[PDB]
Design a protein around this nucleic acid. Sequence first.
DNA 1: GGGAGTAATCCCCTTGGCGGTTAAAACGCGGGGGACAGCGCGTACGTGCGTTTAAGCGGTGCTAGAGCTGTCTACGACCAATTGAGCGGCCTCGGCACCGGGATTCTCCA
DNA 2: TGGAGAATCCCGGTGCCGAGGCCGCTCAATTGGTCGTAGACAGCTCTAGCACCGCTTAAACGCACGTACGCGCTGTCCCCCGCGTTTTAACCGCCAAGGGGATTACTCCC
Lengths: 75, 105, 95, 72, 79, 98
Amino acid sequence: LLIRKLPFQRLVREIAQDFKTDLRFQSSAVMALQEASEAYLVALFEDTNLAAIHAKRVTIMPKDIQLARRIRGER
Amino acid sequence: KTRSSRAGLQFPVGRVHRLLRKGNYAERVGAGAPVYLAAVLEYLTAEILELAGNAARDNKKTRIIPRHLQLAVRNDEELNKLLGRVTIAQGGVLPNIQSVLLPKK
Amino acid sequence: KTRKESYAIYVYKVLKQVHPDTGISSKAMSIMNSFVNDVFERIAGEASRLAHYNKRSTITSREIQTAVRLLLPGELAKHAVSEGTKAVTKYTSAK
Amino acid sequence: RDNIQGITKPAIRRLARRGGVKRISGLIYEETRGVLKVFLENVIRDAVTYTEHAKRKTVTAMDVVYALKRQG
Amino acid sequence: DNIQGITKPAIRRLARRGGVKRISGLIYEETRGVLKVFLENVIRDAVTYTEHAKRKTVTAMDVVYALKRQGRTLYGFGG
Amino acid sequence: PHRYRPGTVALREIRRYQKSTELLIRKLPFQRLVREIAQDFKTDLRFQSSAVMALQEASEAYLVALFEDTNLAAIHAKRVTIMPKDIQLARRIRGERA
DNA sequence: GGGAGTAATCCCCTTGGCGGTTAAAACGCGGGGGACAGCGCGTACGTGCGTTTAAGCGGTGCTAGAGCTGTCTACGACCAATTGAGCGGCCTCGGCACCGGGATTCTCCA
DNA sequence: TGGAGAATCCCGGTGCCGAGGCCGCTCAATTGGTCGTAGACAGCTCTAGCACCGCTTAAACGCACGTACGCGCTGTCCCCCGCGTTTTAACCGCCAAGGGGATTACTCCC
């Protein structure tokens, strides 16, 4: 694991507070959430790496991230 | 008498019940489910026909062509999100020229 | 000739109920029919899987409401939920 | 409140380093927190919907599993 | 081979609908290849559903289900 | 002899082909292409005309979406010309090529 | 007693072809604006060091709420009767594409 | 910078063919009743989740600093566009062979 467990479960509790009050969570639920988020960001950073190497650079810019999410199909 | 008038809709409810029964989605099917589903389909039809009529009035037409449906679905954000992975035959593409390609003289 | 079921007269009723002075072509008829059949299949399949996931054998109004909540984005989902609840309530309260 | 800063600079650095990124700017962080927030907003609402329709007050792991299968 | 029928100005007009100002000459062969791959997958799925459903003639609704298998759904051809 | 500057006719053609809606690839070469591809899988198969029209529509949609993605990738590389590396990048980001 | 094998059929649609012709791709060239290569700088980024903070581990207490059994009752499968909404055949007259003359509007270059 | 000039918009006449009512059936939707059980509800148990606390130690914050490359500028050269000209294949209109999947009848077996 890369992201620490307690900040990520604090974040998922804070974002689930906005949709239903007094919501309780299982521990394997937040572990699966952490694993899915890390897999998403690793795949994203690989795509932005190809975007950065395309434009003759080794430093990644945010415009690489908007290029990756635009070409990938998201908004 | 008929249950579409009883619910207060225009879409059929018995046809929706028969199509839910045929498709084997579950072993049992309730009574309020085709009423709710016909209401949902009628309301989605209400936005798309509203926005298509707005497009046709913009383009000075009285009959809706599929180009006006394409323009209506690709302009509203929620309808473009719901119908993102579809395509409309004889539709065309929204006008979008990127700014850096303009003749900046 | 065989009988083919379409939704053309009902969407023509909806179109004349909203914009009273507007026509429609047969091609646009075909795309609009395809839209309503596809959203029928999508909401129906989502409701079917929610029926299966809770060890339940019946499709009710709750399953269709949850399917509209999952499958439709934005305020369009909330307004469709309101329309469905109003139609179901006046159907049940009818004599 | 303001707990999006828990996704810190070296954690983002390791997430890029597993992906093979060599050099990272300073404006990368303020965009990747936004992308992670958007992804979590799109998952947790489906998890909440599944938990509410089953008439439960606890989000189980299985609800998360079907929530992720929603997006594919 | 009939892949040469997809001519140079046809890909030029496909570029112009997508909003392309300047086109290199090496685009065209790659475009022919990627359209070959896409059509090969689609007709494979269509003949699969037709051979399972047992007719000699492939109908449009079968390739609509083939496109719906790929998540590239089409409206307006009986779908 | 009057001559327009290089670049204006591209703007005119982009506007004219984004405003219109009629199909671009001619019918009979695409018919020959789909028959030749179907020759490889099974033999003596026959097509409806609506099937061929649907394949034309799907090919148009896929290639215009691919060219829009290629154009955005080309602008990101600080150029105007599209190049085959832009197409390869656009297909690698989607995941169509492993 | 009813589903199904076999066959004749009236077609309905598919594929192939043949000549006109005419838009449309193919080609060639002039030439010019962008792709590409190289240099300068200065600015931002990796690395390292010292410190400060909080994550994780253990330990426990309370109690909400998932999970399951018992029972029944209102609700949905299911069947006979019937009947009007919704399908298809068909007639038309208007909506909209097309063509042309002219006004309008960008654009080039001297 | 203003005239040339070509591309675009715009309104009047043309016509054509297709959307939309109208008529007439017919068959699945509606009424009514019957029965069997799915889930609504009650209630019991006791797993798992939330929280309070402390302690140790790895991880991050912060700052200095050297320098690697991002980007702006300039030269070059080349290949791609605009347009004139030449050949060619899509299309069109119709015809003809002819195969093909649904439509009746004739007849058979568990």
